[PDB]
């Protein structure tokens, strides 16, 4: 069954500019049960695929839609899949979101903290608010830039 | 279940009226198959069910459909064994249902009857 999924997913290629520059982007979907990512088929498709985009029922019920788990999702292609306009704001967004993920435990004691820490906390909890989206309303690249 | 479903199929198709199809535990419709499956010579699947669980469930669940000439609203009770929502028999029904209504034991243990789990029971409407 690993051979099953790998024979299929390895067909998604970016051709060699002498075969025609065309490509096929595979976006497979896999359902985990109780978040057991150590299950057999999820581990297979994770080992096979390039990156992963994890979703969370906790984030989903907590309001944030689409409930992307950014801290645990990976992309092995990386910034080479962005335009030059996106990288400049993406670096700062990634750093500030990482600082918010660090200081998330200090939110209940936001009152008794340094002003820089309160700034990082407020910037985090209003950067989380622009990552919310409604269903079937996809932003163009200029709007998200 | 197929008998009652056939009786509802007739009322939807030939009489063209809104049928209301109540089913008790469709976990038993899968459990009976898993009971006979070993004697049918089939090799066992995951945790103990028949290898044809998804197709056997899917045939019955796909015959239940509003067909643009009449509708069938079907309210189904799905016994979840050992309160394990990741069991294969409920897991293969979650794909066939529109509005799932998951009942919690932690609310029944307090008296929040109807113990409908608010954060687990979602709906597509």
């Amino acid at each position: 069954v690993f051979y099953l999924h790998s024979r299929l997913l390895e067909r998604a290629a970016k051709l060699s500019s002498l075969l025609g520059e065309g490509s096929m982007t595979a976006l497979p979907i896999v359902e985990t049960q109780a978040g057991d990512v150590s299950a057999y088929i999820p581990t297979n498709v994770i080992s096979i695929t390039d990156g992963q985009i994890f979703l969370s029922a906790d984030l989903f019920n907590a309001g944030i839609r689409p409930a992307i788990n950014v801290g645990i999702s990976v992309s092995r292609v990386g910034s080479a899949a962005q335009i030059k306009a996106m990288k400049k704001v993406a670096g700062k967004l990634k750093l500030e979101l990482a600082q918010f993920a660090e200081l998330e435990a200090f939110a209940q004691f936001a009152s008794d903290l340094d002003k820089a820490t309160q700034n990082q906390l407020a910037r985090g909890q209003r950067l989380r608010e622009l990552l919310k989206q409604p269903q079937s309303a996809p932003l163009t690249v200029e709007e998200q830039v | 279940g197929l008998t009652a479903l056939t009786m509802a199929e007739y009322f939807r198709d030939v009489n063209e009226q809104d049928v209301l199809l109540f089913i008790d535990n469709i976990f038993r419709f899968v459990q009976a198959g898993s009971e006979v499956s070993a004697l049918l010579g089939r090799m066992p699947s995951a945790v103990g069910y028949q290898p044809t669980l998804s197709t056997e469930m899917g045939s019955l669940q796909e015959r239940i459909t509003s067909t643009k000439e009449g509708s069938i609203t079907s309210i189904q009770a799905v016994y979840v064994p050992a309160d394990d929502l990741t069991d294969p028999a409920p897991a293969t029904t979650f794909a066939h249902l529109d509005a799932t209504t998951v009942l919690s034991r932690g609310l029944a243990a307090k008296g929040i009857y109807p113990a409908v789990d608010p954060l687990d029971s979602t709906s597509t409407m």
Partner: peptide, 11 residues
Amino acid sequence: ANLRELRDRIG
């Protein structure tokens, strides 16, 4: 459903 119990306890 005991492994999800231990997973949530660890969490």
